[PDB]
A and B are shown apart, each in its own frame.
With several copies, the nearest count.
Chain A
Amino acid sequence: SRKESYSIYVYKVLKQVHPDTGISSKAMGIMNSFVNDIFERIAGEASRLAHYNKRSTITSREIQTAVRLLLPGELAKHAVSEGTKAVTKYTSA
């Protein structure tokens, strides 16, 4: 069975951030739990907004305002900037 986890992506991000640092297996389990939890929170809140506004599609605006609701001030600002930058460059490319 091929089980799915975000471990390789966390290694990639870590090497991007700390080339000379390593992660234990348990810390990777925690990180996977965190990523799954955040995905669940954001998708549930996006669905709640879509139903509140009688919509049947999740667009980047719903995700953006979900991030605005969930994250605190500076975190929300930086994450919104990062997401808009990435979406803009993916659209441009």
Chain B
Amino acid sequence: EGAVNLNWGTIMKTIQADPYEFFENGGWSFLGGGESDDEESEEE
């Protein structure tokens, strides 16, 4: 899920150029918004 519409026409060209490097990095994980993996703790 994402708040923003992605430019799939650019993304799919990058993935077509090197499908191996795409999966090496993490593959489809970049679509999960931002992987901060940290407590926001916005409340003071």
- Number of B residues near A (Cβ < 8 Å) is 6
Q: Which residues of the partner chain B approach A28 to less than 8 Å between Cβ atoms?
A: 43
* Pair A25/B41 contact, Cβ less than 8 Å: no
Interface size class, chain A? under 10
* Pair A22/B44 contact, Cβ less than 8 Å: no
- Min CB–CB distance A75 → chain B (angstroms): 24
Residues 17-34 of A, flagged 1 when their CB comes within 8 A of B and 0 if not, give 000001111101000000
Q: Is B37 an interface residue (CB 8 A)?
A: no
Which B residues, 1 to 31, have Cβ-Cβ distances below 8 Å to chain A?
Answer: none
Q: Is B38 an interface residue (CB 8 A)?
A: no
- Min CB–CB distance A30 → chain B (angstroms): 13
Q: Which residues of B contact A (CB under 8 A)?
A: 39-44
